[PDB]
């Protein structure tokens, strides 16, 4: 039960449908935890289903500050309201593999029908999508990740220090 995953990236928010599942009981084995490393089996496991880029630089800094304190924001709430289906109470409620237990209650407060999850399965699935990086996104962007994360890092650092630029 991991069927949707949320990844946050310094160009935009991504949401991945989990096509099939990872082996839960044998999830410390070598022949399972090399599949996260190689690429020909990870795209058997995770496909991209939504990627909304925040385009303003200051809105990227604001999303990064709201994630870094563990709070929902406009673009994140917008794409989860778009992508996450209303799982009706006859079947279940939907599950969402997010990266941190500090963020968890703040999406459970806003969406009732979602259910966040971060065990080591969500941890290493997000680790796999972080490792493979751009090759998952199959061209739904304009701009690489490292220069954008350089700018976002310098801005987040100065906004934390409140460094006097006079």
């Amino acid at each position: 039960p991991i069927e949707y995953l949320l990844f946050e990236e310094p160009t935009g928010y991504a949401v991945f449908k989990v096509k099939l599942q990872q082996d839960d009981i044998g999830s410390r084995l070598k022949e399972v935890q090399e599949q996260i490393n190689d690429f020909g089996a990870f795209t058997k496991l995770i496909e991209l289903v939504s990627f909304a880029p925040f385009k303003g630089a200051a809105e990227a800094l604001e999303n990064a500050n709201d994630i870094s304190e563990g709070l929902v924001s406009e673009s994140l709430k917008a794409i989860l309201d778009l992508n996450l289906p209303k799982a009706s109470s006859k079947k279940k409620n939907i599950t969402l593999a997010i990266s941190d237990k500090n963020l968890g209650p703040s999406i459970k407060e806003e969406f009732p029908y979602v259910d966040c999850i971060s065990n080591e399965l969500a941890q290493d699935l997000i680790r796999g999508v972080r490792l493979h990086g751009e090759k998952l996104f199959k061209g739904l962007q304009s701009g690489d990740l490292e220069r954008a994360q350089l700018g976002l890092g310098h801005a987040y650092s100065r906004a934390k220090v409140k460094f006097s630029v006079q």
């Binding site: 399972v32 020909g40 237990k101 259910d115 971060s118």
Partner: protein, 461 residues
């Protein structure tokens, strides 16, 4: 005059660019594919040899084990990777098998722990908070049945009530439990079987035949309101909570240790007793054990069905576990290791690929059921190859040389010698039975599937 000649044309066969894939043109003629049966036979023989090459069943321990050998193991039923083990010096533990570590431990009782199971216990004055904490309960022989919460990071919804939610206490001792999986009811066994629910400190009902102790119980997996048990009058009893009464009772020739229902038939169960064969009974006609799995050398200490509904795991008092199929009656295959002694509790996991065995040395080992199917998600041509040559092995399993390759194991020398002398004893007693039947005239051909039953209340209908 009209002539023609075939045109290879070198463009629809070899490509135009470099990167695209060349054609594999195809003609399915039995002219051009001459040896059908011998070639798929040799593919079956290579399948058997490669299965023996990849027969690597053992996957891991979990933790550093318990203190002094386990005696009860309870898989949960909602989630997959959570498994409770209770062991001899009153120690219960609740393992997350993903990282293969323990959530919490408890000095649960004083004497031997006897049986535990997990529940999603619906209280009436409280919402079931079963997506943030998980509940297991455990009965021992010092007259206590404790129900415990467990903090568990399966989810991350919330942010504290760690252990010992409550303690039911009984008159006599307790020998086993299992939880009715609906409406928060659980049954125990001891001097006589009792039925509690978690809103009372006193037993709601008492359901014995006579004053005879009851070694083990089990509920169903569907049609939940009936259950079965086994007592040391060598007896199998059934009960029905809808009538709130016992309902039938057979008596075998030796004491049944562990019973287990089928989670796909709902009226078949397996039964593991001290004579070295796990019987497999149909409920609504308890005169004939409609199968008998007959390959051990010592007492059959536990059995369980896989949730796919056709494989049996068993674990013997001799230091070995076996996996059977339902439809055969002999052993598919066998696990053993030098460092396990006296496997007392075996359970399939809900993934139906991993059997959790628990020895008396202290460890709770794990094994792959299929000892060669790996667990990674495989590419489609590889899955086609595996299912194809597995179907070839299944179709050709009666050929003698691939039978004598697919059959043999390294059975340990104790089990091999003792099964050899048991086989020569059984051949000798069959020879003396043939002599006695050569003489006498009123001698019934006693069926093997009814050999062990020596009495049934409600005799025939």
């Amino acid at each position: 005059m009209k002539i023609k000649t075939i045109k290879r044309s070198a463009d629809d066969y070899v490509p135009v660019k470099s990167t695209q894939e060349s054609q594999m043109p195809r003609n399915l003629n039995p002219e051009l594919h001459p040896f059908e049966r011998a070639r798929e036979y040799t593919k079956a023989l290579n399948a058997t040899k490669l299965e023996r090459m990849f027969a690597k069943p053992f996957v891991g321990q979990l933790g550093y084990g318990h203190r002094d050998g386990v005696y009860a193991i309870a898989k949960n039923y909602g989630s997959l990777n959570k498994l409770a083990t209770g062991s001899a010096d009153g120690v219960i533990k609740y393992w997350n098998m993903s990282t293969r570590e323990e959530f919490v431990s408890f000095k649960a009782h004083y004497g031997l722990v006897t049986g535990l199971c997990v529940t999603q216990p619906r209280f009436h004055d409280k919402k079931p908070d079963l997506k943030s904490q998980n509940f297991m309960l455990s009965c021992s022989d010092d007259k206590t049945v404790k129900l415990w919460s467990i903090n568990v990071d399966d989810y991350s919804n919330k942010n504290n009530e760690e252990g010992l939610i409550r303690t039911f206490d009984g008159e006599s001792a307790f020998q086993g439990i299992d939880s009715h999986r609906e409406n928060s009811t659980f049954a125990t066994g001891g001097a006589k079987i009792h039925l509690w629910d978690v809103n009372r400190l006193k037993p709601v009902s008492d359901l014995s035949w006579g004053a005879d102790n009851i070694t083990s119980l089990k509920f169903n997996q569907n049609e939940t309101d009936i259950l079965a048990s086994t007592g040391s009058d060598n007896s199998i009893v059934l009960y029905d909570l809808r009538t709130n009464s016992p309902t039938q009772k057979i008596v075998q020739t030796m004491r049944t240790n562990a019973i287990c229902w089928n989670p796909m038939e709902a009226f078949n169960f397996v039964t593991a007793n001290e004579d070295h064969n796990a019987y497999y009974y149909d409920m609504r006609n308890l005169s004939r054990s409609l199968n008998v799995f007959k390959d051990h050398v010592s007492a059959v200490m536990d059995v369980d069905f896989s949730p796919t509904g056709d494989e049996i795991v068993t674990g013997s008092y001799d230091k070995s576990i076996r996996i059977y199929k339902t439809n055969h009656g002999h052993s598919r295959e066998i696990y053993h290791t030098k460092r396990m002694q006296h496997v007392f509790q075996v359970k399939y996991s809900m993934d139906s690929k991993y059997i959790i065995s628990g020895s008396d040395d202290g460890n709770v080992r794990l094994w792959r059921s299929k000892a060669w199917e790996r667990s990674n998600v495989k590419t489609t041509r590889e899955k086609n190859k595996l299912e194809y040559d597995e179907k070839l092995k299944e179709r050709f399993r009666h050929m003698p040389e691939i039978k004598r390759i697919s059959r043999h194991r390294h059975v340990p020398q104790v089990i091999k010698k003792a099964q050899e002398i048991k086989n020569i004893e059984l051949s000798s007693i069959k020879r003396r039975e043939a002599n006695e039947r050569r003489t006498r005239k009123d001698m019934p051909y006693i069926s093997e599937r009814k050999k062990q039953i020596v009495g049934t209340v409600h005799k025939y209908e």
